[PDB]
Design a protein around this ligand. Structure first.
Ligand code: BNG
Ligand code: 0YN
Length: 177
C-alpha cells in the first residue's frame, strides 16, 4: 500500500469529522448525515478496505473528541465503529476504468447508506426506545427515525455525488502518474 493511499484515507476521515460538526438535525434524532460523503467518495475511489478503515478512523475521531453520543460500550461500538466502517461496502462498486458511469455510484451510495442506517435502526431499538414518541413501539419508532434519516442522507449524498460525477469524474477513478 502507498503513502499516497494512507494520505487519502486520513484526509477524508479528517474531512468527515470536520463535516459531522455542522448542525444536521431536521427533527429530534432525524438528521441529514452529509458527513458520510467523504467516506463514500473514499470507498468508491479506492475500494472496500480503504473505505472500511477510513470509516473506522472517523468513528474513533468522533468518540475521542467528544462529538459522539454514547450510552454504553456496546452501543458506542455498534454506532461509532461498525456503523461508520460499514460505509466501506460502497467500495465494492468502484470503477477502475473510464468512462465513469453514474449507476454504480448511486447503487453503491444507496446500499451503504442503507447498511449504516440499518445498524442505527437496530441500535435505535435496543438503546434508544426510552425516547419513542407517545403511542409508538420501539421498532416503529426506530424505523421512522432511522428510515427517514437514511433516506435524507442518501438524497444529500446523491445530490453531491451527482454534481461530482458530472463536473469532476476522475475523482472516482484512482490513477497513478
Ligand atoms: C421528513 C422529516 C421529518 C420531520 C417531521 C417534523 C416536521 C418538521 C417541522 O415542521 C412541521 O411541519 C408541520 C407540517 O407542515 C407543520 O404543521 C408544523 O408547524 C411544523 O413545525
Ligand atoms: C431512535 C434512535 N435514536 C438515536 C439513534 C442514534 C443515532 C442515529 S444516527 C447516529 C450517528 C450520526 O451522528 C446515531 C448515534 C438511533 N440509532 N436510533
Amino acid at each position: 500500500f502507498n503513502v499516497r493511499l494512507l494520505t487519502e484515507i486520513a484526509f477524508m476521515a479528517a474531512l468527515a469529522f470536520i463535516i459531522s460538526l455542522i448542525p444536521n438535525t431536521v427533527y429530534g434524532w432525524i438528521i441529514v448525515e452529509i458527513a458520510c460523503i467523504p467516506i463514500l467518495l473514499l470507498s468508491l475511489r479506492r475500494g472496500l478496505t480503504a473505505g472500511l478503515v477510513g470509516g473506522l478512523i472517523w468513528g474513533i475521531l468522533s468518540m475521542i473528541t467528544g462529538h459522539a453520543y454514547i450510552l454504553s460500550l456496546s452501543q458506542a461500538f455498534l454506532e461509532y465503529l461498525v456503523a461508520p466502517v460499514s460505509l466501506g461496502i460502497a467500495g465494492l462498486f468502484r470503477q477502475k476504468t473510464a468512462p465513469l458511469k453514474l449507476a454504480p455510484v448511486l447503487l453503491g451510495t444507496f446500499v451503504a447508506v442503507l447498511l449504516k442506517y440499518f445498524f442505527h435502526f437496530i441500535a435505535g431499538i435496543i438503546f434508544w426506545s426510552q425516547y419513542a414518541w407517545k403511542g409508538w413501539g420501539a421498532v416503529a419508532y426506530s424505523l421512522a427515525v432511522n428510515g427517514i434519516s437514511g433516506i435524507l442522507t442518501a438524497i444529500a449524498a446523491f445530490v453531491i455525488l451527482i454534481i461530482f460525477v458530472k463536473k469532476f469524474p476522475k475523482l472516482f477513478i484512482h490513477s497513478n502518474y
